[PDB]
Amino acid sequence: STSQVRQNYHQDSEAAINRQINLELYASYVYLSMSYYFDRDDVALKNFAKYFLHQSHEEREHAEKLMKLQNQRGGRIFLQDIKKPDADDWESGLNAMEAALHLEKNVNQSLLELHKLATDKNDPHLADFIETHYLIKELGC
Amino acid sequence: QNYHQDSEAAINRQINLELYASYVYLSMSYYFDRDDVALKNFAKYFLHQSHEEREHAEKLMKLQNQRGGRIFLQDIKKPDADDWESGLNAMEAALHLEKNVNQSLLELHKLATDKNDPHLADFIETHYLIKELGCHVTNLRKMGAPESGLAEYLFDKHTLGD
Amino acid sequence: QNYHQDSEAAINRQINLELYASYVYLSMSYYFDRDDVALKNFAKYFLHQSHEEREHAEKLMKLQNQRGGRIFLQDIKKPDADDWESGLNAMEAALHLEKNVNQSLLELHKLATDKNDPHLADFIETHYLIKELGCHVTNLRKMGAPESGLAEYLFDKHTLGD
Amino acid sequence: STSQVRQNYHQDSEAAINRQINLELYASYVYLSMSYYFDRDDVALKNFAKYFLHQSHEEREHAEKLMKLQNQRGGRIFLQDIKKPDADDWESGLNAMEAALHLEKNVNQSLLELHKLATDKNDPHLADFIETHYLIKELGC
Amino acid sequence: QNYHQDSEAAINRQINLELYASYVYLSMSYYFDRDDVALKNFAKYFLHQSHEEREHAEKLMKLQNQRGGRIFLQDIKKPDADDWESGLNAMEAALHLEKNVNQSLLELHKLATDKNDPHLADFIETHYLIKELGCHVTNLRKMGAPESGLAEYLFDKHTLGD
Amino acid sequence: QNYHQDSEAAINRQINLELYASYVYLSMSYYFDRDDVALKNFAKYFLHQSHEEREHAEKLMKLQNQRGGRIFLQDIKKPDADDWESGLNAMEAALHLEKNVNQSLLELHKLATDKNDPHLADFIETHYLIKELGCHVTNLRKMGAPESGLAEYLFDKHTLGD
Ligand SMILES: [Mg+2]
Ligand SMILES: [Mg+2]
Ligand SMILES: [Mg+2]
Ligand SMILES: [Mg+2]
Ligand SMILES: [Mg+2]
Ligand SMILES: [Mg+2]
Ligand SMILES: [Mg+2]
């Protein structure tokens, strides 16, 4: 039924988190694909390949910090297929950055709609977790 | 010649198999992180292995890029369970999984007939991981798992705490 | 405006709740110090937590003094048991207690709507303590407590000895 | 009529640049407004105020580098009203970051639609200017 | 009392006036950057002044925040010309502009009656800038501008090259 | 495939165009060295540019050799004038020349579709040289050239003496 640690954790947030977990795993897959595109000698842009491999590891680390939260609050993790990124070729180097911009802002407006949902269900703990997660993801550098 | 496009496909399939394995141990790790499961070293064990299997996927990605092949990703499927039931059952599953991933790893080397013997370094370690999961499965059963929640507790401490 | 005197009362009530919690873990600590109970690390665990919850009470006292409120102490009630029966039962009790103290801690922040987010640092750690007592309760039950006096003995050694 | 230095500069690009100039001036105004919001003692978040003041100076510097381009290619600069940013209060600190995300991606997808238009009108010079402008604006840190 | 909200409005209006001035000299700077105008030091002169007038706007923003007022931004209007015709005409325009911005700067001090005399530091420099634009206008006219394109060329070199 | 032999021809034609430009500015330089013309800095300006355009020709020669193409030289034609009439007229000519050489430079990049973007570094600077010759032409006309021999004298001193 229900977890001995659960407290003030709306079913709606538990499911928004499960979706955010898959989203960030998807983003990690996309970045990984883009990284090894700029690895191939067709392209051989080592600084792009480095940059995206870094962002792929960081998006995967965020997914784990989301999974750690779910467990900390008695939510239950439910994983789905990590879907194939919708390109293999990425063509240009700036066609990649365009794709990363729609992904990065999709990931981010999903966090904000999770902060919205957090203050709806008066959940200071979640709200504060997402907020600090969002500002480090943006203002870290 | 149909070797380059068979070697290319095999590596493409091995990339997906290692990534899937990384997904499975990730799933398993955070099952032992549940407050109602609560075996920290079981969690550490699988999370560490989850990173090993992703390292291997990138090495297969690096490799296909040097062979002049093309990387062709596919969906990473969800693993068969959300609830892994017990410490014993998670190990038995890893053992089962690692053997099959090992089998198609062979055929990629079996067709490779490569001068460099590419992935064979990593094929050698899969045989270490198999005997290890074997030894783990054995010890847990002999101790009384999975119905003896004391067995897995003490195995979490004494075997997976080093 | 009725916010200052509601914020003032909430903090006054949270002061008493943390002090009561410090009293409960003090009681629990010296139960495991009984010669007929004799679980030293269970004793250390609760005695340490008993000081944490008193630290928090003084921080709520410091806090009300900076908000210009007035501290209004009340009796610190005796805890519900003198005999805590078992290691398992003491944890289950702490879990129950910490959740309720957590609930009114929310409402003090829920009304605070404070620029500084005052006590929210300490509200974040109550959620760590809850998952921890959860994991403890789980491990003891899976091991066979509370009727297996061996379970609690080995949990005292292996989980609470670090 | 037409400038003695003009060469391969489509009228369409000259107008896309004039619009991009005003866009980045608008972005500089918005960032400046947000910066001095986090300056007021209601808020007093010095690190947010610092961050946005920096981004306000940088968006204004980009506008000048656009104006320098227009002149370098015989385009003619036409400036419009810099419109009042559509808030004074910015409320939260994360309500600001949300506003910056829709602004920042509006600014950026406007650059990309200018790179699109550049390769349409086979303008290697413009295309390369925008491309390097876009990657420094993103990968600078 | 209606002083705080009049002081607040004046500063709000002075913020917009300085920002507008920064816009005007920005416009003027890049007119002299045109390949068909081509007076680099005229360009440097106005671009530098364009930054001075923006510095002042932020100081008026900092100032309203310390007086506990609220900053209320408005549109920054486009300047009256896109083509500034000549070096002489741009100076005559700056002179005209700076005098009016100076006038409402007075009234903000004239009502301020402030203990600290806030913006009066910056009000003193507007009177230096006016006499300077005066001297510039004069020299260009005496030299034969704006119809003597040699006059402005040599003024660009000899007066605005230091 | 007809790209290698079109890329090869374009570079061959760009080699000749840059060499011709180097010849034109060489001619122009020593016109201002005539005792009856006598503008030293006009002479230095073009002689320096004459070397820049030859540097570029050799880089296009180095480039065709790395693309595995063959260098196919042609006559370097005499420039259209022996007498360049005035400082203004020499600049107007350079402006005209540099624009056309720029145009076929595009088409060599427009067909290149190269991974490395070879000559695009040098294509970017032609756009700096154009705006500069533009600014020069403008300043000389505004000053009264070419019939004002004082205009070109002072432009030789004040603009081309740095
Ligand atoms: Mg992320
Ligand atoms: Mg960013
Ligand atoms: Mg493997
Ligand atoms: Mg507490
Ligand atoms: Mg910008
Ligand atoms: Mg002023
Ligand atoms: Mg050239």
Residue numbers in the entry:
A (entry chain B), D (entry chain B): 4 to 144
B (entry chain A), C (entry chain A), E (entry chain A), F (entry chain A): 10 to 171
Extract from the study:
As a standard structural component among protein nanocages, ferritin exists ubiquitously in both prokaryotes and eukaryotes. It is a nearly spherical 24-subunits protein with an exterior diameter of about 12 nm and a hollow cavity of 8 nm. Structurally, the 8-mer protein is a heteropolymer that is composed of two different subunits (Hα and Hβ) that originate from the same polypeptide. We have described here a protein-engineering approach to convert the 8-mer protein assembly with C4 symmetry into the 16-mer, 24-mer, and 48-mer protein nanocages with higher symmetry by controlling the intra- or inter-subunit disulfide bond.
To answer this question, we prepared the third NF-8 mutant termed Δ3C-∇C where cysteine residues (Cys90, Cys102, and Cys130) were replaced by alanine (Ala) while Asp144 was mutated to Cys. However, we excitedly noted that the inter-subunit S–S bond formed at subunit–subunit interfaces of the 48-mer protein nanocage when its crystals grew under the crystallization conditions containing Mg2+. The structure of the 48-mer protein nanocage in the presence of Mg2+ exhibited nearly the same geometry as the above-mentioned 48-mer with exterior and inner diameter of 17 nm and 13 nm, respectively. Except for the inter-subunit S–S bond, one magnesium ion is bound to two acidic residues (Glu141 and Glu141′) and two water molecules by coordination bonds at the same subunit–subunit interfaces. Comparative analyses indicated that the formation of Mg2+ coordination bonds is a prerequisite for the generation of the inter-subunit S–S bonds in the 48-mer. The formation of Mg2+coordination bonds with Glu141 causes a movement of the D-helix of two Hα subunits by 0.9 Å; consequently, Cys144 and Cys144′ residues from two Hα subunits are in close proximity, resulting in the generation of the inter-subunit S–S bond. Consistent with the existence of the inter-subunit S–S bonds in the protein crystal structure, we found that this large protein cage is stable in solution based on the fact that its size and shape kept unchanged over the time range of 24 h after the crystals were dissolved in buffer. Thus, the cooperation of the inter-subunit S–S and metal coordination bonds located at subunit–subunit interfaces greatly improved the stability of the 48-mer protein nanocage.
